[PDB]
């Protein structure tokens with residue numbers, strides 16, 4: 001059920017109604033996190049962080065407070081490490097922030113780095129709680145710099161999330177219909193999945209309206225970047241007072257989204273199969289997801305193959321509904337590569353000048369094409 005895997009019927013993998021304020025005990029954390037643009041611009045971010053006293057995480061009594069605290073600390077860590085994003089980095093996270101951050105991270109079974117689940121699934125609010133979940137009625141809780149387009153980037157990522165995730169509620173219907181041998185129910189279920197994934201692609205079109213390519217590339221990308229295979233932090237980051245040696249953690253990407261990974265799993269697309277950089281990255285990103293969501297993903301893997309059921313029926317209707325789900329993923333990924341051209345490739349070529357690295361740390365072109373091609377090759381027909 002939704003209670004076991006923390007999948008909300010309305011927002012899916014997103015944290016429903018995220019907490020906006022921490023108890024008064026954590027005001028020193030909140031001020032820095034709410035003023036990252038101001039503190040980074042004035043060159044007072046590092047000093048504010050270095051001046052913090054060590055605060056116990058014991059006053060964060062519920063999941064919503066813990067998730068807000070993780071987001072606050074994750075954003076602060078990104079600002080402290082990357083600074084102004086011009087090249088002056090910090091390889092030691094001060095103990096008074098690194099110790100409560102790692103403690104909170106350990107409790108939430110998440111790495112001590114800003115992840116998708118923080119920055120997208122918990123970084124939002126409704127302006128008016130009586131109006132629906134649309135861009136116009138929503139805002140993010142935290143930004144890195146003035147004009148970084150984080151509102152547009154995080155909210156569009158979230159809106160695509162909620163759109164695609166309105167199909168996860170159908171997954172139990174799919175497995176029960178295969179089990180009970182209900183052909184019509186399975187057909188209707190796959191069509192509803194295809195519909196939600198088609199709707200998610202149209203939701204993705206809003207990106208051009210709220211994200212500026214220059215702002216995204218030369219400002220926002222910096223703060224979502226991590227310390228695993230990054231030449232700027234080759235040995236990783238020192239979490240002072242928590243671990244002696246520097247630790248490596250990948251930056252944030254929608255490769256940490258449970259919604260796209262769960263549909264690849266359900267449809268037997270096998271993005272995680274064998275070796276190769278793509279499979280390794282997508283499997284590694286499951287431990288950058290909330291534990292209940294990591295649990296949901298491998299639970300789908302233990303279920304019988306939807307792809308094998310459809311293939312064993314000699315039913316054009318079923319094969320077509322399955323192919324409608326796979327096509328919708330291919331269309332989403334093909335569109336995603338058009339966006340990568342506009343938001344990464346074209347601005348990267350305008351820089352005053354081996355392979356282009358994503359914030360997640362992949363050779364993004366080869367990775368995204370590998371993943372797209374694996375989806376397309378799962379089509380039963382399109383010869």
Ligand code: HEM
Nearest residue numbers: 156157160253254255260340343358359360361362364371
């Ligand atoms: C300015 C817009 C965007 C750009 C430049 C972009 C870029 C990237 C890049 C570079 C990767 C490769 C992983 C990495 O190394 O970071 C990636 C992966 C991914 N992105 Fe985005 N992305 C954008 C918007 C979105 C949006 C709105 C979604 C939908 C929530 C999305 C979904 C994905 C998914 C699902 C992956 C994992 C690979 C896959 O399953 O296809 N991206 N993105």
Ligand SMILES: Clc1ccc(Nc2cnn[nH]2)cc1
Nearest residue numbers: 114115116119157252253254
């Ligand atoms: Cl921390 C974080 C991680 C990923 C995103 N979105 C994204 C979408 N495609 N790649 N990355 C936003 C914030």
